Design a protein around this ligand. Structure first.
Ligand SMILES: CCN(CC)S(=O)(=O)c1cc(Nc2nccc(-c3ccnc(-c4ccc(NC(=O)NC)cc4)c3)n2)ccc1Cl
Ligand SMILES: O=P(O)(O)O[C@H]1[C@H](OP(=O)(O)O)[C@H](OP(=O)(O)O)[C@H](OP(=O)(O)O)[C@@H](OP(=O)(O)O)[C@H]1OP(=O)(O)O
Length: 1286
C-alpha cells in the first residue's frame, strides 16, 4: 500500500495529493487529543460491538503506525536514495519528489508531535522514540520540554536507562536535572526514584511535599512548569502502585490534595482510578465483603451470580486499560468462587468466564508476533498464566499440579533483566489460593512450599534493586522504617532464608550484624545433613565480605591468629569455625605470608573440604594459593639447624646455614659455594628446605587439577585461566614440582584443554626430557574423540629434532584410526602448497631488472629454471625458449621481452580442473573450534577467482555434508602466524562477556574470523559473508551526487584532497613541493572543515533505518550496533590496531554489528609509518551520527566503561596469553620488540596509558580516549586514504 501511494504521486483513490495528508492529519490529531483526556469517545476507534473488536482496534492502530513509517521511508528513498537497500525509483518519481521535498518535510515535522502521542497511546515506544530523535535533530536552530518528556517516558517503558542518561547529559548543555530520576526508575529502583521525585517536586514547588517513607540515608546507601509537576506526581503514584504499597498511595494522594489546595495549581490531577486501588487493597487484605462492594462500582459486566461481550464499551485502545479490565475480571471470578464455596452449581458460569478471560488475554501476545520484537510482554504473559491457573483450580479444586504458577527459582539465573513487578501478580494470586486451602476438606496439592519459594525469589529480586521496603515485607511474610528495626526483627528453605536475611541486613548498612549472623548460620549448617550448597555459599559470601572490609577487619584476623597460638563476637565465631574437626602449616606461611591473609586461606580450605562437590571453592583456593606462592617465591630470591650441626660433627655454622638458603646447575653451584665457604648431608638438607619454601604451588596444582576434573558448572574464562596457570607452572618450574605433574597430567580430561592447543604446540621445544614427553602424550590423548582439533597443525608442522619426533608421533597416533583421512588431507595440503609459475617468473624478472643497475643473476635464473623444470605443461610449451634465450644472452633483451609478455598476459578466472578433484571426503573443515558435530568436505569449487589490489589473493568455495557453501581465501608469501594468535586473543576476550550477556538485550560480542597457516608463508583465511564495507556507501553517494549534478567516473579521495590542499597552500605562500611534515596546521584544519561540510552525516544512519522493517527492529539493531562499535573501539584501543579505513570496516545489516578485516597494523605500529596517526580508533562524523542524537554520551560511553571494567578485572589471563605469544618461535614479530609491545599493553590495561605514576580511572580513561579521537587537531593531520571527512 505504501509503495502504491508513493508511486502514484500521492493520487490515491482516497482523494487528491492534499486530501490524503489532511485525512491522516485529522485522524492522528483526534487520537492525540483523546490521549490527553480519556473521556473523548472517538468514533470508530474506542467503541466496539464485542470482545473481538477491541483487539481489532489495537491491530488497526499498529497497522496505521507501520504504514506511516513505511511511507516516510519510501519518500526519503524517493527524494534522496539508498545504497544496496532499496531500488532507485523511476526518473519521474525522483524528479517529482525532489521539487516537493520541502512540503513533505514540513508536513512530517508538523505532525511529528501528534505522532509521538499516538505511538505512546498504542504502547509502541519505538515509534515515538524514533520520531522524537528525528524532531530533536531537525530542531538545530516551548515545545522543547514536552519532546524530552515524551522521549524520556518512552525510553523508560523500554527499560533503557543508558539512553535516558545520555539524553540528560546532552540536554544539560542547553533546569532539566529530573531526568536522572526516571533513569534510575527504569533500572527497577522504585524507592530511590520515588524519593528523588518527592525531593524534586518539593524543591520546584516551594512547599513540603514529602511523605512518610524509609530512612533517606539508609535508602541512599543501599543503591518550573505545570506539565513537569503533573508528570512527576503521576510518576510517583505509578511508582507506589508498582511496589504494591496501598498505604503509601493513600498518603501520596492526601499530600497531593493538600498541595493542590495550598498552591491553587488547578492543573495537577492524578490519572489513576482509586476505586481499583481500593479494590486491590481489600482483596489482598482478605476482606472479600468490602471487595465485592468496591467491585460493584467498576465498569463492565456485573459480578457472576452474555459471555462474548464481557469488556465494556467506550474502551480506549491503551494496553493499560485492557490489563486493568483483565485484572478486574480475575478479581471478580476469585471473589465469586470464594463466596460460592463458602459441583456444577456455581462452576458452569465461572469456567466460561475464565475461558473468555484467557482468550482475551492472549491479544498482546499475538500482537507482539505481528512485529519483529524478539520478546514477549511480561505483564500480559503473567496475566494469561494466572487466568489459566484459575480456570484449572476452579475445575480441579486444587487437586493437580497444573493449578500452580510456573514461576520457579530457575528464573534467578535466567530472568535477571526483569524488575520486581512480575512477581507481584504471582504472589497476589498465590496467597488467595493459600487462604482458600483452609476451606477444602479433601486432599490438595502442597502450596506452602511453592508460596515460600515464590516469595523468596521475589525478595531476592527486590533486594538486588535496593527495594528495602518491599524486601522487608516479603521476608516478614515468608517468616510468618528504621535501621535498628531490621536488626532487632531479623537477628528445606531454611538456609536460603537465613542467607537472604543476612544479605538484606548487609545491604541495609549493618555489615557487622550481617557478617556475625552469616558466621553463626555457617556454624549451624556445618553440622547439618546435606550442607552442600549452603555451607559453601555462606563461607564464600563471608570471605568476600571480609575481603571488601579488609581495612576495618584487619585487627580481628590478627587477634584470631594470636589466639590460635597461645576477642569480639566475630573473632571468636571465626575461630570456632576454623577449628572445626573434619594441609596448611603455620611454618610454611611463616615467611612472606601475612598473618591476616592466612585466615582467608583457612576459610577456603575448610569450604573446599566441607563441600567437595562444588567447583567455586576449589577455584578460589587454587587462586589464593597460587597468588601467595608466586609472591613468596618472588620475594625469596630448628630441625634443619640441628640436622646440619649433627651431620657436621661459630662462624662456620653461620656461613653454612646462610649458604644453604642463600638464593634457593643449582646442585653444582651450591656444592661449590659450600666448599669455598666451609673449606655430604648438605644435599639432603637443601632438598628438604626447598620443598617447604615451594609447597604452595603443590596445593595450587592439586586444587586446579581437582577443579578441572569436575568440568569434564563454570564459565570458560574461569577454566582458561586455570589451564594457562598450570602450563606456566609446568614451563617455568618443571623440575621443582615434577612429581605432581607426573600423575596429574596422566588422568585429567581433554575437554577443558582444547582452548590452549596452540600454546601446547608452541611449547614443544622445552629444554627438558619428561616435559616434552608429557606434552606429546597429552596431545595424543586429546587427538582421541577429537581429531579435528590438532589435525591441521600436526600435518603442517610435519611437512632441531625436538620439533620433529613429537610431530611424527602425533601424526602416527592420529593415523591409527582413519589412515585414509590422514593420507587424503596430506595430499590436499600438498596440492594447496603447490597451487600457490607465471607469477614466480614475473617476480624474478622484475627483481633482476631492478637490481641489475652478473653471477648472481645467472645463478638465480638457473635455480628458477631448474625448480620450474594441465597448466604447467601449457606454460612450459608456450614459454620453452626462456632457458635457451637466457643461455644465449649469458655470453639481455630476452629477459625484458619475457617480462613484458608476462605482464601483458597477466591482465583472472581460473579452474580447479586445470590446477586433485576428490569427493565424499572425511577431512574436517579448516577451523572447527565451535562445532558440536564436525563437517567433512564433500566437494571443491570448479573455478577459483583472484582478487586485485593485493599481492596474490585467491577466493575459493567449499561444500560440506549439509550442502553449505564455505568460502575461503589464499595468502602466499605473507606469514599469518600472528593473525591466529590475534584471533585466539579475541576469542578469549569474548569469552569474558558470557556472564554479562545473561541479563542484557544487546550482546557483548566482537565479530572475528578464523585463519590457519599452511607452513611459513602460505595461509587460508576464512571468508565472512553478509557484511558490507563502509566505503560502498560513500562511493554510491558520490555517484548519485555526480548524476544529479549532471542533469542540472567519480574523483578518488587523493585527487579530491589534493584539489583542496593545492590552492590553500598556494594562497598561504607555500607550494606543493614542500614536505608534508612542514605544513601549516590551520590550512589542514580549514581543508578538513570545508570537506566535512559537503559530505552528509546520514550515510550510515539512514542506511540502517532503511534496511529495517519495523520500528522495534530498528531500535534493536541500533542498540546492537552501538554496543558492538563500543566493544570494537575499546578492543582496538587496548590492542593498538591501526589503519582503520573505510575498506577495513564492515557492517552487518542483519544485526548491525561491526567487524574488522586487516589485522596487520596493530600493537601501535601506525605511529612509525610515513604519516603517523594519533587517533586510537575511528570516530568519524558518520560513525558518531549513526549512534543517535545523543552521540557518544549515551550507550556508547556506558558500554565502553563496562568493557574496560571487564578487561581490567581479568587482565591476568590476558597478560599471560600475551607473554605466551611473545615466547613463540613460530611468530615473526619483525615483519626486544615483543617485550616492548607487552609492556605497552600492560601499561594500557593497568590504566597508566599516559601518566608518570597517576592511575587513571575507567571514566577518566574513557573520556580522555574519546576526546583524543574526536578533536579536529588530530583528524586534520592524517593520511588522505583514511577518509577522515566521511
Ligand atoms: C569491497 C572489497 N573488499 C574489502 C577489502 S573484499 O575483500 O572483497 C570483502 C571482504 C569481506 N570480508 C572478509 N572476510 C574475510 C576476510 C577478509 C579479508 C579481505 C582482505 N584481506 C584480508 C586479510 C588480508 C591480510 C591479512 N593478514 C595481514 O595483513 N598480516 C598478517 C588478514 C586479512 C581479509 N574479508 C566481505 C565482503 C567483501 Cl566484498
Ligand atoms: O544473590 P545470589 O543469587 O546468590 O547472587 C550471587 C551474587 O549476588 P550479590 O552480588 O548480591 O552478592 C552475584 O550476583 P550478580 O551480582 O552477578 O547479579 C554473583 O556474582 P558476584 O558476587 O561476583 O557479583 C554470584 O556470586 P559469585 O560470583 O561469587 O558466585 C551469586 O552467587 P551464586 O552464583 O552462588 O548464587
Amino acid at each position: 500500500a505504501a509503495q502504491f501511494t508513493v508511486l502514484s504521486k500521492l493520487r490515491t483513490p482516497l482523494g487528491r495529493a492534499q486530501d490524503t495528508f489532511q485525512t491522516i492529519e485529522g485522524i492522528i490529531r483526534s487520537l492525540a487529543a483523546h490521549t490527553l483526556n480519556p473521556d473523548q469517545d472517538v468514533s470508530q476507534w474506542t467503541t466496539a460491538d464485542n470482545d473481538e473488536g477491541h483487539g481489532n482496534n489495537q491491530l488497526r492502530l499498529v497497522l496505521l503506525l507501520q504504514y506511516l513509517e513505511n511511507l516516510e521511508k519510501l519518500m526519503y528513498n524517493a527524494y534522496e536514495g539508498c545504497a544496496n537497500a532499496l531500488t532507485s525509483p523511476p526518473k519521474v518519481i525522483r524528479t517529482f519528489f525532489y521539487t516537493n521535498r520541502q512540503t513533505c518535510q514540513d508536513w512530517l515535522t508538523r505532525i511529528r508531535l501528534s505522532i509521538m502521542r499516538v505511538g505512546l497511546l498504542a504502547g509502541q515506544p519505538a515509534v515515538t522514540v524514533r520520531h522524537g530523535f528525528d524532531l530533536l535533530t531537525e530542531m538545530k536552530t516551548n515545545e522543547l520540554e514536552v519532546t524530552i518528556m515524551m522521549v524520556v517516558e518512552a525510553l523508560c517503558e523500554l527499560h533503557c536507562p543508558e539512553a535516558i542518561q545520555g539524553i540528560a547529559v546532552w540536554s544539560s548543555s542547553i533546569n532539566l536535572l529530573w531526568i536522572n530520576s526516571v533513569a534510575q526508575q527504569a533500572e527497577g529502583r522504585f524507592e530511590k526514584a520515588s524519593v528523588e521525585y518527592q525531593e524534586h517536586l518539593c524543591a520546584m514547588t516551594g512547599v513540603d511535599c514529602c511523605i512518610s517513607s524509609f530512612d533517606k540515608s539508609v535508602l541512599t546507601l543501599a543503591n518550573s512548569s505545570p506539565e513537569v509537576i503533573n508528570y512527576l506526581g503521576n510518576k510517583a503514584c505509578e511508582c507506589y502502585i508498582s511496589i504494591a504499597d496501598w498505604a503509601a498511595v493513600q498518603e501520596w494522594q492526601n499530600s497531593i490534595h493538600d498541595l493542590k489546595k495550598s498552591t491553587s495549581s488547578t492543573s495537577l490531577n492524578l490519572k489513576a482510578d482509586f476505586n481499583y486501588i481500593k479494590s486491590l487493597s481489600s482483596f489482598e487484605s482478605g476482606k472479600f465483603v468490602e471487595c465485592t462492594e468496591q467491585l460493584e462500582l467498576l465498569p463492565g459486566e456485573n459480578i457472576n451470580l452474555d459471555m462474548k461481550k464481557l469488556l465494556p464499551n467506550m474502551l480506549s485502545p491503551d494496553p493499560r486499560e485492557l490489563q486493568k479490565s483483565i485484572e478486574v475480571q480475575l478479581l471478580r471470578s476469585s471473589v465469586c468462587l470464594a463466596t460460592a464455596l463458602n459441583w456444577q452449581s456455581i462452576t458452569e458460569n465461572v469456567v466460561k468466564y475464565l475461558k473468555q478471560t484467557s482468550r482475551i488475554a492472549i491479544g498482546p501476545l499475538r500482537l507482539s508476533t505481528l512485529t519483529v520484537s524478539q520478546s514477549l510482554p511480561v505483564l500480559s504473559t503473567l496475566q494469561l498464566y494466572c487466568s489459566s491457573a484459575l480456570e484449572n483450580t476452579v475445575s480441579n479444586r486444587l487437586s493437580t499440579e497444573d493449578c500452580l504458577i510456573p514461576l520457579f527459582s530457575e528464573a534467578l539465573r535466567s530472568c535477571k533483566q526483569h524488575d520486581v513487578r512480575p512477581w507481584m501478580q504471582a504472589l497476589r494470586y498465590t496467597m488467595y489460593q493459600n487462604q482458600l486451602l483452609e476451606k477444602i476438606k479433601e486432599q490438595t496439592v502442597p502450596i506452602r512450599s511453592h508460596l515460600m519459594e515464590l516469595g523468596l525469589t521475589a525478595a531476592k529480586f527486590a533486594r538486588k534493586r535496593g527495594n528495602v521496603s518491599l524486601a522487608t515485607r516479603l521476608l516478614a511474610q515468608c517468616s510468618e522504617t528504621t535501621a535498628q528495626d531490621l536488626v532487632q526483627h531479623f537477628k528445606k528453605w531454611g538456609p536460603e532464608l537465613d542467607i537472604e536475611k543476612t544479605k538484606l541486613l548487609y545491604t541495609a548498612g549493618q555489615s557487622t550484624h550481617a557478617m556475625e549472623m552469616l558466621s553463626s548460620c555457617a556454624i549451624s549448617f556445618c553440622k547439618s545433613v546435606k550442607a552442600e550448597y549452603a555451607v559453601a555459599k555462606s563461607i564464600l559470601t563471608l570471605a568476600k565480605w571480609i575481603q571488601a572490609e579488609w581495612k576495618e577487619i584487619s585487627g580481628q584476623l590478627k587477634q584470631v591468629y594470636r589466639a590460635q597460638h597461645q576477642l569480639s563476637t566475630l573473632s571468636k565465631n571465626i575461630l570456632t569455625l576454623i577449628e572445626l574437626p573434619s594441609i596448611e602449616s603455620e611454618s610454611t606461611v611463616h615467611i612472606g605470608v601475612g598473618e591476616p591473609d592466612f585466615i582467608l586461606g583457612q576459610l577456603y580450605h575448610l569450604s573446599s573440604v566441607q563441600a567437595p562437590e562444588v567447583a567455586k571453592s576449589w577455584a578460589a583456593l587454587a587462586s589464593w594459593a597460587y597468588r601467595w606462592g608466586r609472591k613468596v617465591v618472588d620475594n625469596a630470591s630448628x630441625x634443619x639447624x640441628x640436622x646440619x650441626x649433627x651431620x657436621x660433627x661459630x662462624x662456620x655454622x653461620x656461613x653454612x646455614x646462610x649458604x644453604x638458603x642463600x638464593x634457593x646447575x643449582x646442585x653444582x653451584x651450591x656444592x661449590x659455594x659450600x666448599x669455598x665457604x666451609x673449606x655430604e648431608g648438605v644435599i639432603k638438607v637443601w632438598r628438604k628446605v626447598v620443598d617447604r619454601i615451594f609447597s604452595l604451588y603443590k596445593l595450587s596444582c592439586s586444587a586446579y587439577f581437582t577443579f578441572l576434573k569436575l568440568n569434564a558448572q563454570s564459565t570458560d574464562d574461569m577454566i582458561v585461566m586455570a589451564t594457562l596457570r598450570l602450563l606456566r607452572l609446568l614451563v617455568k618450574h618443571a623440575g621443582e614440582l615434577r612429581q605432581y605433574l607426573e600423575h596429574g597430567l596422566e588422568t585429567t580430561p581433554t575437554a577443558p584443554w582444547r582452548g590452549i592447543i596452540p600454546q601446547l604446540f608452541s611449547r614443544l621445544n622445552h629444554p627438558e626430557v619428561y616435559v616434552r614427553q608429557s606434552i606429546c602424550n597429552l596431545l595424543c590423548r586429546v587427538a582421541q574423540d577429537s581429531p579435528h582439533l590438532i589435525l591441521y597443525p600436526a600435518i603442517v608442522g610435519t611437512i632441531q629434532a625436538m620439533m620433529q619426533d613429537c610431530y611424527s608421533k602425533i601424526v602416527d597416533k592420529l593415523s591409527s584410526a582413519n589412515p585414509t583421512m590422514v593420507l587424503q588431507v596430506q595430499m590436499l595440503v600438498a596440492e594447496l602448497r603447490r597451487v600457490t609459475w607465471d607469477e614466480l617468473w614475473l617476480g624474478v624478472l622484475l627483481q633482476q631488472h631492478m637490481y641489475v643497475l652478473x653471477x648472481x643473476x645467472x645463478x638465480x635464473x638457473x635455480x628458477x629454471x631448474x625448480x620450474x623444470x594441465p597448466h604447467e605443461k601449457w606454460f612450459q610449451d608456450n614459454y620453452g625458449d626462456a632457458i635457451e634465450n637466457a643461455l644465449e644472452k649469458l655470453k639481455x633483451x630476452x629477459x625484458x621481452x619475457x617480462x613484458x609478455x608476462x605482464x601483458x598476459x597477466x591482465x583472472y578466472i581460473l579452474r580447479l580442473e586445470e590446477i586433485a578433484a576428490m569427493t565424499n571426503t572425511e577431512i574436517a573443515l579448516p577451523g572447527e573450534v565451535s562445532a558440536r558435530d564436525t563437517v567433512t568436505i564433500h566437494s571443491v569449487g570448479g573455478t577459483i577467482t583472484i582478487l586485485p589490489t593485493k599481492t596474490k589473493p585467491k577466493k575459493l568455495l567449499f561444500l560440506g555434508s549439509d550442502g553449505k557453501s564455505y568460502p575461503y581465501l589464499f595468502k602466499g608469501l605473507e606469514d599469518l602466524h600472528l593473525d591466529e594468535r590475534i584471533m585466539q586473543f579475541l576469542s578469549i576476550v569474548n569469552t569474558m562477556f558470557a556472564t554479562i550477556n545473561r541479563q542484557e538485550t544487546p550482546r557483548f560480542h566482537a565479530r572475528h574470523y578464523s585463519v590457519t597457516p599452511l607452513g611459513t608463508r602460505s595461509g587460508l583465511i576464512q571468508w565472512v559473508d553478509g557484511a558490507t564495507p563502509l566505503f560502498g556507501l560513500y562511493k554510491r553517494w558520490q555517484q548519485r551526487e555526480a548524476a544529479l549534478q549532471a542533469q542540472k567516473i567519480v574523483p578518488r579521495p587523493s585527487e579530491l584532497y589534493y584539489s583542496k590542499i593545492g590552492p590553500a597552500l598556494k594562497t598561504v605562500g607555500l607550494s606543493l613541493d614542500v614536505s608534508r611534515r612542514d605544513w601549516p596546521l590551520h590550512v589542514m584544519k580549514a581543508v578538513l572543515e570545508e570537506l566535512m561540510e559537503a559530505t552528509p552525516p546520514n550515510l550510515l544512519a539512514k542506511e540502517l533505518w532503511s534496511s529495517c522493517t519495523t520500528p522495534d527492529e530498528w531500535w534493536r539493531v541500533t542498540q546492537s550496533y552501538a554496543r558492538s562499535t563500543a566493544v570494537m573501539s575499546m578492543v582496538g584501543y587496548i590492542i593498538g590496531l591501526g589503519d582503520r579505513h573505510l575498506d577495513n570496516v564492515l557492517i552487518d545489516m542483519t544485526t548491525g554489528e561491526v567487524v574488522h578485516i586487516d589485522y596487520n597494523v596493530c600493537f601501535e605500529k601506525g605511529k612509525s609509518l610515513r604519516v603517523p596517526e594519533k587517533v586510537p580508533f575511528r570516530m568519524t562524523q558518520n560513525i558518531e551520527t549513526a549512534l543517535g542524537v545523543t552521540g557518544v554520551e549515551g550507550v556508547f560511553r556506558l558500554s565502553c566503561e563496562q568493557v574496560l571494567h571487564i578487561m581490567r578485572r581479568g587482565r591476568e589471563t590476558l597478560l599471560t596469553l600475551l607473554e605466551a605469544f611473545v615466547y613463540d618461535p613460530l611468530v615473526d614479530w619483525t615483519a626486544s620488540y615483543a617485550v616492548s609491545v607487552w609492556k605497552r599493553v600492560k601499561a594500557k590495561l593497568e590504566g597508566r596509558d599516559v601518566d608518570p605514576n597517576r592511575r587513571m580511572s575507567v571514566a577518566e580513561q574513557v573520556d580522555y580516549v574519546i576526546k583524543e579521537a574526536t578533536n579536529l587537531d588530530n583528524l586534520a593531520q592524517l593520511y588522505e586514504g583514511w577518509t577522515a571527512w566521511v
